[PDB]
């Protein structure tokens, strides 16, 4: 039966149990992935509101610092490009990304969306033709099968992910996995099927919005943005377009158990729905770098129209 | 059918016969790059481009005995597994050359039959293609995309024109949206007779998605031989983007005073939809890697096109 959102934890919601499952609010939680920094800024002036509390060690600055000034100062170069880039009423799935050279922290990855009158803001810390190669094999696979085994194949090689599958979801909702590039040693799941409440319904119409999530490390502590709350509204600040948004705890208590130390997927979407998923699994933490996770994004778009096509190819 | 080509003795083209001049078998490249084609099996040069002792810096016999093996040593395997036999004639493997008399040479293969066709030009060594991925996306309707497109395309080119030129069920074709640097003539809302691009170079733009001028004034360069020695018969080059171009498109070009000139299919359903349509006043060789960009562009486009018409129909 699907039910409302609770309130989220902060706001006295309940605690989160198999039976209530589809109702967490998992886009607003309060709080960030440790490898990264997150601010909020006012749309119109740029005033600094929100910052997850380690903000101060990948930006080098007191916090009292960064929130006495607005971006004009902090982003002189990028203040400009973001408000040609994000205008007002823009939906909250676009995003505007930069490389900054930040003094203390080096090459920085800036992404920036647009929620309404607020801004977010997400640091993380940056670094031949195997894309063009990829794209071309993809489109010379000559059904959905090979299409799904190349597609898995190149996702492992581009980044070292222990298991790549591909997750087909049925009209139920019910998923399978329809291909996977796998470790040696590691157990297949390959035609396994997983029932619909492993992707509660919640996340699934956020999947078909924002088209890539992971989990840096299973085991690490959310930071919470301070305030929690935005001043502008006081309520909650919407993350479901930040890839540093914290992972809810159902689903990291689901993945500890399997051994995984690092969750990535990308939604394929066709027509509108939500087709599959190119889930990866590591046994360790592992962080992928901004501009190797663009490559999986770009894949993401491929593989959504070549899914197109070679269904067409089929009837 | 097909008329045979000039220098097998074929008919001059006109425009009483547009639809019959034989333009992926023209024996000649444009003189930006350089071509070599060779054997399957044994790797072994069977042509080259009269210009090739340019670019490689090797003296002329030397190649046309060589063996791609002994030749690119590194890269020899690495095509035989990217492009096995029977693969298609769409599939392409790229590789940047560090080649010593050349700074750094892009590599572009494929297989036609028992033949690898292999292309070098000049290349070197960020967010505009993401940025531009999510402009698209969020694109409210297909008259708003258009002009996103156009405008990020001649963003990251600096063409002097790009156009969107949608066919209709006719193949007349209608230039809906266009961004142009100040003092052009604006070909917004203009349409064009089908006979513009033939029935022939439309059917070769379904499967090959980017071609190029880039010097409308530039003379071709034969392939040596012309004829391929495996079959005594025309090497097909229309997967090859240094095709020479036909000389009544350059003289098309020429009359409209364009000097460079590229274009990127726009596939929908398996049908052509529309190009990705750019123009410079003077000559331009775009670089392969800016090209690649606009190779993935015009796949995106092409899926964006789907989503937006589908929310009006
Ligand atoms: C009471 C709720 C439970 C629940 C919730 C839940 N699950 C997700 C997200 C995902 N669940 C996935 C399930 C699988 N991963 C696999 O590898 C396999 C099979 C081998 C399955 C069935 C997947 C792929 C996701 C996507 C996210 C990811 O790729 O890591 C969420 C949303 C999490 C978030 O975005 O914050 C939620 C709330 N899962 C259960 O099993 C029950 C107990
Ligand atoms: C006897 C036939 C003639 C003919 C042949 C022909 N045309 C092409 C290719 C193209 N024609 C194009 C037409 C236009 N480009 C524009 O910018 C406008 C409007 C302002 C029009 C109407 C285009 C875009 C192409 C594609 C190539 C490109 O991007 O430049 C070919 C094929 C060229 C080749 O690949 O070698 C041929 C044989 N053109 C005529 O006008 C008639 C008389």
Redo the contacts between chains.
Sequence with gaps: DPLPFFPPLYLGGPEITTENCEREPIHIPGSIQPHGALLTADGHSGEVLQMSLNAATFLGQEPTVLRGQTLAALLPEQWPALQA?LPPG??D???????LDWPAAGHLSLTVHRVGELLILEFEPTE??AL??A???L??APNLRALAEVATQTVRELTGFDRVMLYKFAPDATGEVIAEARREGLHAFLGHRFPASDIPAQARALYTRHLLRLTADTRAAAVPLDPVLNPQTNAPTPLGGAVLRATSPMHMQYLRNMGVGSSLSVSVVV??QLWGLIACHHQTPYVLPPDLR?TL??LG??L??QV??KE?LEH
């Design positions: 880039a823009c939906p799935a676009l995003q505007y990304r930069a490389t031949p033709h063009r190669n794209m071309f094999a489109e010379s027509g509108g663009t994004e770009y778009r491929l959504s129209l197109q096509v067409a």
